[PDB]
Amino acid sequence: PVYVDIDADSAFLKALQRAYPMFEVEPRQVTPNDHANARAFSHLAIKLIEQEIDPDSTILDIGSAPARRMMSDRKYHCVCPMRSAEDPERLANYARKLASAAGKVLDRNISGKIGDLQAVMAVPDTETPTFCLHTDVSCRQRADVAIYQDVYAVHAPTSLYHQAIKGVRLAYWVGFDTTPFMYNAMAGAYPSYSTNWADEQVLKAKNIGLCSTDLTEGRGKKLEPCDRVLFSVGSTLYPESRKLLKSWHLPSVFHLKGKLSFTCRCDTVVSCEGYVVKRITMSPGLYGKTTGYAVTHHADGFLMCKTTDTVDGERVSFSVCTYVPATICDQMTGILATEVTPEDAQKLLVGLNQTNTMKNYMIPVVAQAFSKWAKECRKDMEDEKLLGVREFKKQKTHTVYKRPDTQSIQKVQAEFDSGLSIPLRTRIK
Amino acid sequence: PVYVDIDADSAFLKALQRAYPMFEVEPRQVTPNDHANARAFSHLAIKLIEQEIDPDSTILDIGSAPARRMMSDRKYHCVCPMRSAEDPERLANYARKLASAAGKVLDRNISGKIGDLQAVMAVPDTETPTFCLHTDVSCRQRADVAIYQDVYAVHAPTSLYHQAIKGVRLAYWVGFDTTPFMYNAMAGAYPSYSTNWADEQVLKAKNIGLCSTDLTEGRGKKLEPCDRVLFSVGSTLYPESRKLLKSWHLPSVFHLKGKLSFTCRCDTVVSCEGYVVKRITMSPGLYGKTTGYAVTHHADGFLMCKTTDTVDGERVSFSVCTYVPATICDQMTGILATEVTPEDAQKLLVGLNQTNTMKNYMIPVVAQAFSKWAKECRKDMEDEKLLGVREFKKQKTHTVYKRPDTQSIQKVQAEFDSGLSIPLRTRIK
Amino acid sequence: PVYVDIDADSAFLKALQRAYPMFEVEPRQVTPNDHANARAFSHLAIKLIEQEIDPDSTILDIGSAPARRMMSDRKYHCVCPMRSAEDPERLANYARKLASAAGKVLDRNISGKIGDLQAVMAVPDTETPTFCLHTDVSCRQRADVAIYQDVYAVHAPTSLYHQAIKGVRLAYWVGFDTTPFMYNAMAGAYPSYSTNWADEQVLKAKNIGLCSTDLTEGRGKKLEPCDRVLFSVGSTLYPESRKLLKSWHLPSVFHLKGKLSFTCRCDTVVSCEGYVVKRITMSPGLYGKTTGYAVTHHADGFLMCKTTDTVDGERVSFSVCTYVPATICDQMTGILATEVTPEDAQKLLVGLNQTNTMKNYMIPVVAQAFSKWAKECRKDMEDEKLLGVREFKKQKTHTVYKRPDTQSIQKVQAEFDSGLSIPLRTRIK
Ligand SMILES: Cn1cnc2nc(N)[nH]c(=O)c21
Ligand SMILES: Cn1cnc2nc(N)[nH]c(=O)c21
Ligand SMILES: Cn1cnc2nc(N)[nH]c(=O)c21
Ligand SMILES: [Zn+2]
Ligand SMILES: [Zn+2]
Ligand SMILES: [Zn+2]
C-alpha cells in the first residue's frame, strides 16, 4: 500500500506502477499538477530505500532538503553546503517549519532538530547529528548508508570516496538517467518530468524544447557538445556539467584506489521514463577485476537522432534525444517494419496518443527519429557484406533507437585513484 | 474552495483551474462579462499570495488600488503616487467607500483607514501605515513582503532595490507575460483578457487588433520596435515602455550591487493565457554565480509571426504575437505534421473552435503563423548539413512557435549596480 | 431586474442584455415597434447613470426632454434652449402632462414643476431649479453631474468647459457611436435603431439607405465628405455637422486649458450596435500627459467599404459604413478565410439571417465589404516584403473591417484652450 500525489487518470501513475513492482501505488492528488511526477518518483525511491536499510543505521542526506525530512523518523543527517542562491530560502522555511512543529507534535524529535539548528547557528562548523554546513567532501559526521538526491554537480568517485573514508558502505543516487550524456546528445527532453535540457551552444535554436530564436530576416566551424548544459525543469533553471553528469554513470564494478582502497558496484534498481535510482556498494579491498562497462537496461524506448536546425540564423545539425514510452514502440513495431515517412509516422503517433501518453511537442522529432532509424535499417538489410571479415569506409549513423528490453553498453573508467553570511545568519534566528 | 466572477460556461474558468491547481475554483458571475478574466486572475493571485505570507507581516501594495482593499484584513500599506489622471478618481471612490463603510461594519478597521486618510490630507508627506503619496522609490514605510499589481512603467531593478533598502525581502508581481517583448514583437494580443497592444509605428495598420487605417485611394526606411507601445485593455488605453516592460522579465538569479548588495531569484509561479505572477526574493549578500538567463515555461502555445500589412498606405512587414490555447496546439499537432495552407488551417481552426475557445479575430493570423512554421519545419527537414560543424549564410526565420510544455531561454542582464493639487485635496475632504 | 419596451422575440433584447450586463433585462412591449430599440437603450443608459450617481446631487439634463422626466425623483434641471421648431411641441405636451399630473399624484413634486414653469413663463431668464430657457453654454444653474442625451450639434469641449466652470465634475453622453465620422464615411447606417445618414453630396444616390434618385434616360471633380450630413431616424430628419460629431469622440485624456484649467477622461461605458454611453470626468488642474488617442472597442463588427454608385446620373465612388452583428462575423470567419464573391457572400449572409438578425437592405453592401476585405487580405498574404524596413508607393485600401473584440485608435485633439415667442408664451399658459 503506497500513496502517490498524482491523479488516477494520469499515465504516469501506470508508469510508476511498472517502475515500482514491490509497492502497490494508488493516486492521491490535491495540490500539484506540474511537478507531481518527479515528486512521486522521489517519494517512492525514498520509501524503497528506507524499507531496504537498517532502521538503526545513521544515514547521510547529501541531497539535503531538510524541509522535506519532517516525517522521516530515521537517523537523518542533512548536509546543506550553502552553495546556491536558493539554499537560504529552503533553510528559512525549514526553520519556520520547525517552529510550526515546535508546539504541535512530539513524535518526530522536533526539539532535537531545533537544538541542532541553534547549535549550528551559534557555530557554523558544528557536527550536529541532523545538520551541517559542509560539503559532502568536507563533511565530518560518520554514518553507515548515504543517500543522494538530485546531485548532478559533484564528481561521483570523489564524493563516494570521501564518504567511504567516513565509513559509508552503501549509497543511493536518485536522479535523471545519464544515458543521454553517455551518448553525447546536444539537446534532450524528459517529457514526463516536465524537463528539457540543451547545450549552451544551441540555446538560440528554433525547434528544440529549450531554446529562444529571433525573427531575423536572414542575410568556429565545429559544433560539438560542451561541458556546460542547461536544465529547464518546468520553469526552473539548473546549470549542470557534462563531465559531472558523465560521472554518476558508474560501471558495474569500479575501484577507488587511494589511501584506502575499495571495490564498489553500481546497479540501477529503479528506472522510470528518465529517472533512475542507482545503488553503489562501497567496500575496502579489491574483490575481482573491473570490466569497465556500464549497462543501461532500456525499459522504455530511447531515441537519439541528429536533427537539422538553425542557430543564430545559420543552418546546422546536432543530436537530440528523448525517452519514448514502451507502448508507443510496441505499437510502432509493425510500421517501423516498413519505410515510414516522418509525416505518416507523426500521424500514426498522434493517433496512438489518442489525454496523451507522450507530449506532442516531441512527436515531431520522435517521428523523424523513427523514420531515420527505419531507413537506416532497410539500407542495412539492402546491402550485405562477407561474414567473418571487417571489410574502413566509415559511413553515416544518424539515429540511435534503443527499443524496450534492450541494453546499452559503454566502456567507462573503472579505476579511480563555512559560507553562511552574517546578515543571513542573524535573520534566520 | 475558491469563488470566481465568471460564468460556468466560459473556457477561462477551465484555464484558471489549470493555472491554479492549489485552489478549487467555482464560477460566481453577476455584474461583469468583459473584464471578468483579468479580475478573476488578479483575485486568485492575491489569494495565493495572502495564503503564502506571514499573517503578521506588513506588506506594501505598490500596485495601489485602495478601493479594492476593503476586505483584506492583513496589514496593507497602499502606495498611491498620484501620477496619472485617473488616480484622483480612485481616491474619490476610496474615500466615498470608506464613508460608505464608516457606519456599517467594525471588523475591517474602517476607523484606522479614515484616520490615516485624514492625516494624509492634513499633510501629504505623512508615512501613515495604510496610505502614502510617494512613489515606491520615494516611499518611506517599512514592511516585509511587497506586492506589485499591473505595474509596467517602473524599472524593476530600481524599485526592488529601493524596497530592499526598506527591508523588503520578498516581492510579487502580477501582470502581463513579458515574453512578447523579449521576442521584440511589433504588435500582439492577449485574446483572453480582452487586451491588444501595438507599437506606435503600426497604429495606422489595417489588420492587427489595435489599429485604425484610412480608406485612401493610393498613389526613414527602417521599421523597428520603439520604446513607446500602447495597450488597449478592452476600451482603456495604457501607454507603456518596451524597456520598462523588458525589465520585469528578470533572470532566475540576479544581483543588485550598490550600497547594500543583494542576490535575488525570480520564479514565475502562476501563468494563464498571458498573465503571470512572478515572485522575486531579495536578500543581502552574494549567494552564487548569476547565469544571466530568464526561463519562460510556455504552458500554452505562443505564436509570433511576421505578417505583412499596409501602414499609411505603404506595404510593410512586421511581427505580431499571440497566445494560442494548449488544446488548439494539441489538436493541430497532426495537421502541422503536414504542409497546411493558411486557408485550410483557418478552416480547421474554426472547426476546432466549434461558444469559442479562441477569439476569431486572431484565427486569421494564428493560421498564417501555423502554416509558416510548418513550411519552415519541412524546409528544415528537407535539407541536412554535416553534423558537428557550424557550416555564415544567415537565412529566413519568419515564425516562432513555442508549443505547450516548451521553454524559452533569453540571456538578460543579471548584475544591476507630493503631487496632489490644492483644489483636489480640498474637494476630496 | 430591468424592464424594456421590446417584444421578447426581438434580437435587440439579446443585444441589450449583452450591452448591459449589470442589469437583468426582460421584455415589456405594448405600444412601440419602430423606435423601441433607441428608447430602450436610452432608458437603460438613464437607469445605469442614476444608479451610479449621488442621489442628493443636482444634475443637469442638457438633452432636455422634460416630458420624459415625470418619474425621475432625482434633482433634475432640464435645459430647453428653444432652438428648434419642435421644442415648443414638447413644451406644450410637457405642460399638458403636468396638468394631467396636477391632480393625480403627489409623489413626484408636481407642484414644484408647475411653479417652476409658471416662474419661467413670467420671466424667461429665470434660473428655476427644474427648467430654463438658456443654452448649455449660457445656462446659469449650478449642479454636480451633467447628463447629455442625443446632442450632436454642440462642440463637446466648449459645452463641457462651460459646465465645469459651473461646477460640473462628471458628465455623460448617450448617443450614436462616432466611429463612422472619425473614419470619414460619406454615408452609413445604424440598422438596429432604424437610422440612416448621408452626406448632402450623396442625397441623390441610388442604392444607399437614405437617398432618392431620378429615373433619367442618361446622356467640381472632387467628391469628399463635407460638414453637413443628414440623419433619417426612422421617418424623422436631423441635419447634423461632421465637425460637431467628430467632437464627442473625445480622447481618453484631454486638457481644457482656459481661465480654469482641467484634466478630463472620457471612457465609453456602454456600446450596443451603434449607440454609445460616453462618460467624461472633469477636474481642475493638469493630472498627467495627454496622449491624444481615442480608443473604440468594437464589441461587434464595423464595416466601412467604398461602394460605387451613380449620383445625379454620374458614376462616382464613395464610402459607406455599417455595424454588422458579432455573430455574423463569427460565422463568417471561415468563409472570409477564402476569397468569397459578393453574390456567394450575400447568399451565406441571407442563410445566416434565417425573423432576421441584420436588416436585408444592408446585406448587399455587407457582402461586398466582406468580399473586398477578403480579397485585400489575400493580396496581402500573397506578397511579402523585407521585415524591419518601410520599403512610398501608396496603394489601394478599399475596406475597413473592425471585427468584434478589436480596437480602433485615432489621434485626436487633446488640448483645448431668450428665444421664446410672445404668441407661443401666451398660448402655452
Ligand atoms: C537539485 N536539483 C533538482 N533537479 C535538478 N536537475 C539538474 N539538472 N541539476 C540539479 O541540481 C537539480
Ligand atoms: C495599471 N494597469 C492595469 N492594466 C495595465 N496594462 C498596461 N499595459 N499598463 C498599466 O499600467 C496597467
Ligand atoms: C435630438 N436628437 C435625437 N436623435 C438625434 N439624431 C441626430 N443625428 N441629431 C439629433 O439632434 C438627435
Ligand atoms: Zn556532517
Ligand atoms: Zn509609505
Ligand atoms: Zn439653468
Numbering used by the authors:
A (entry chain C), B (entry chain B), C (entry chain A): 3 to 221, 230 to 364, 376 to 412, 423 to 448, 458 to 469
What do the authors say?
NsP1 is the membrane anchor for the complex, forming dodecameric pores that associate monotopically with the membrane in the necks of the spherules to gate their entrance. Enzymatically, nsP1 also has a role in addition of cap0 structures to the 5′ end of the positive-sense viral RNAs. NsP1 possesses both N′7 methyltransferase and guanylyltransferase activity and reverses the order of these reactions. Each nsP1 protomer is built around a methyltransferase fold common to SAM-dependent methyltransferases with additional insertions (membrane binding and oligomerisation (MBO) loops 1 and 2) and extensions (ring aperture membrane binding oligomerisation (RAMBO) domain) that contribute to pore formation, oligomerization, and membrane binding.
In order to investigate the structure of the pores after the capping/decapping reaction, we analyzed by cryo-EM the structure of nsP1 pores incubated with a cap0 11-nucleotide-long CHIKV RNA. However, after the decapping reaction, we could distinguish two different three-dimensional (3D) classes; one similar to the previous structures and a second with significant changes in the first 130 residues and the C-terminal alpha helix k of nsP1. Electron density for the m7GMP base was found in the GTP binding site in both classes. The nsP1 protomers appear tilted outward 8° with respect to the equatorial axis of the ring. The pore opening results on an increase of the inner aperture of 3 Å (from 70 to 73 Å) and the outer diameter of 12 Å (from 178 Å to 190 Å) and a change in the surface charge distribution concomitant with a projection of the active site toward the top of the ring. This conformation resembles the structure of nsP1 pores when expressed in mammalian cells (Discussion) (13), and was not observed in datasets of m7GMP–nsP1 produced following incubation of the substrates and uncapped RNA. Thus, we can conclude that the decapping reaction induces a motion in the ring resulting in an opening of the pore aperture. Here, we show how the postdecapping state induces motions that trigger an opening in the pore, similar to the open form of nsP1 complexes expressed in mammalian cells. This open form increases surface exposure of the RNA binding pockets, with a concomitant redistribution of surface charges along a path leading to the internal pore.
